[PDB]
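Researcher: Quick one. two chains, 150 residues in total.
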Amino acid sequence: NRGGSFTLQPSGQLMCNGARITTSGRIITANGVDMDDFYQKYMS
Amino acid sequence: KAIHPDNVVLENDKAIITLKPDGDTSLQNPKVTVEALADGNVKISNGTGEFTMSPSGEIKGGNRGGSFTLQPSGQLMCNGARITTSGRIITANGVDMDDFYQKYMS
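Model:
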């Protein structure tokens, strides 16, 4: 995209400008926050 | 048989390969089309959908009910949800993951 990248790595880890979506669907944002981890702190 | 005044057309019963002097090349058939135009345009297309790249570096997927769009500025997009160059996952509802995380843990 020359300013972006719809990259898919051989291991199946979707990537876009650093943000990753693991094979298990964990949305690891570029800032390191995992959605499930942030959810767990909530609802405590 | 008729002859095209200016075109090198290699043709079969229903499969056609056309190269024009002005760079453009095209593969055609009654349900698919793969054209590469002079101006950096790629428009791989099909009846069920299409995929294209603009000269401006855009990459899009015509899911016809979805879009794997990548804008020239590197901002990944999918049905409105954006992933900025810095990896900020801005969901279509406007919520930023880091912003929501910050309110938590307070």
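The first helix of chain B runs from residue 97 to 103.
Researcher: Thanks, that's what I needed.
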